Amino acid sequence: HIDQLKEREYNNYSWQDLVASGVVEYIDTLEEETVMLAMTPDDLQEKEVAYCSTYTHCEIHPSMILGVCASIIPFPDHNQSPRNTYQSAMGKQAMGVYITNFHVRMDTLAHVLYYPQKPLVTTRSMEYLRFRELPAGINSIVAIASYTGYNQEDSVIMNRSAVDRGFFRSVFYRSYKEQESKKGFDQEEVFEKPTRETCQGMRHAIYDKLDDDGLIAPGVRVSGDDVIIGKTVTLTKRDCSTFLRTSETGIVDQVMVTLNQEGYKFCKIRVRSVRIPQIGDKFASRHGQKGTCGIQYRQEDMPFTCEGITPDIIINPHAIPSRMTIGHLIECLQGKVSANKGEIGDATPFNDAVNVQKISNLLSDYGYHLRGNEVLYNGFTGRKITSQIFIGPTYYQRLKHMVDDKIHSRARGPIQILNRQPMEGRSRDGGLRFGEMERDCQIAHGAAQFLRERLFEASDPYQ
Amino acid sequence: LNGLTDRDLCELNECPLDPGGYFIINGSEKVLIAQEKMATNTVYVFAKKDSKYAYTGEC
Amino acid sequence: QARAGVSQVLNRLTFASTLSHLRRLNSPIGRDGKLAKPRQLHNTLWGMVCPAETPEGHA
Amino acid sequence: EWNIVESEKALVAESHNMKNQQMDPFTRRQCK
């Protein structure tokens, strides 16, 4: 069967042949309780202490239990279950090429990464998950250490030169939808530049930026509170047009115009934005080691090995013992081995032939410490560091939780209509909620004046 | 796109890598989550204690 | 009166997310229940449901 | 194809060098 299957594709041999031949069998959860399952065919049947010797079935491969997001995790069994679950939930938030035909799609909130490299260590399961073709991360030379202190409580230090060369530099799109319709007998919408004379309702923004058709042309500079579509509804006309959301500051990619099912002019516009990786952006590896970039140093300041190899990311050593993520260390070691050899390594969860000792022995055959530690130098003074740092390639991701999309402020912004209190939401330019727990804390501090100010003066004065 | 070669898919502004199996309503990808429930036509004998019955033969 | 969340927007943020979303389940039990027996990973979920991939919030 | 032949040669080589396997970081269950 193996020979006939290895020659598939070429002739016509497929899984149906195995099923019909009577070699495999579908056992459902209700029947699985009445069969003596076995893990591996060779190990659990040879001849030893008589355990059962009545196996009816045998699994294909133990690692197949994992799902989709868990499979991409290298060495999951070498890590504690909560961190595997955190990685499985965070994998879905990793950026990259989410679909090859992204330039044709007009979805809302699309992120794409420039150089999505492939993991240096790939499990045998992701070969079918299609991850290698559409990865979501870059292999970075990570050095677990505490260089300065900006990477202490779950934080990292990225290389400014690396970012300059395009390290994890992704893009941010933002599509729009807007169409005209017959509101009423007298009401009617139409795309047209709202001039300074006929249109009564109008915004204090620039309008000549777009063409006469009323749609901003592609590849034009835009910023917050700028008109993107020239819609004007006749009452003379009211500027019932949309504007780019505050704190977006992008460039228009392409403009699409068409007719909807009703037959009115329907148009979509998407604006891109080159998001340079800056401090505050959330990153994460394939083991649950989340974190935010604290500070970025240039190459001259970062440490360096015996040759010019400066770390690209520096996580906190203290995040390892409490969380017990030895799988991450094994990944780093195997990645160093793979890079030195020059071929992707195997990180299958259960393999019975990938331990640490053999990997270490391989790594010792290239002029590097068998445990992966190496001697760095203080990037500032140039004195060797007493402790031999542990540096090596490792596959890291980038989440969409950018700092610019979360930063918010307020200073007597718009007010609601029902209860004259500030709005809610960054997009609507609202203020934070001074929850009841904050009130209790302030009462505990006894600062009655501050409490009354927050609840009356800067909330909703009225006589 | 039933059994269509990758050539046409590429020519139709689509990719052969898309898993598919998602509806398109009003230009939005809708997916049906697989809901789970209790198997029908099977007898279950529970032992609810916070009631007047010692055993309950639900079916 | 009917259920909610049966048809969700397919999260097209990365191919892994698309694969995960297209093969996701959801129990009909009420959200944030005091009980803790249905949430716990049961022994029968061997090779059928990933024992690691799952949210970490209230669900 | 080269990866397939590489895997096959690795398997046959692993089968050949069956002299001794004394390693510290590995274990397996043995019930009863």
Binding site: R8, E9, I60 | - | - | -
Partner: peptide, 28 residues
């Protein structure tokens, strides 16, 4: 003939065939 020892490679050919014949979202 049985396949002793040399089984790690033949363990994944079956998986490759299965995923080629049936897709990931085949159930839907």
């Amino acid at each position: 003939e049985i396949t002793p020892d040399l089984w790690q490679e033949a363990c994944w050919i079956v998986i490759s065939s299965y995923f080629d014949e049936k897709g990931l979202v085949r159930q839907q």
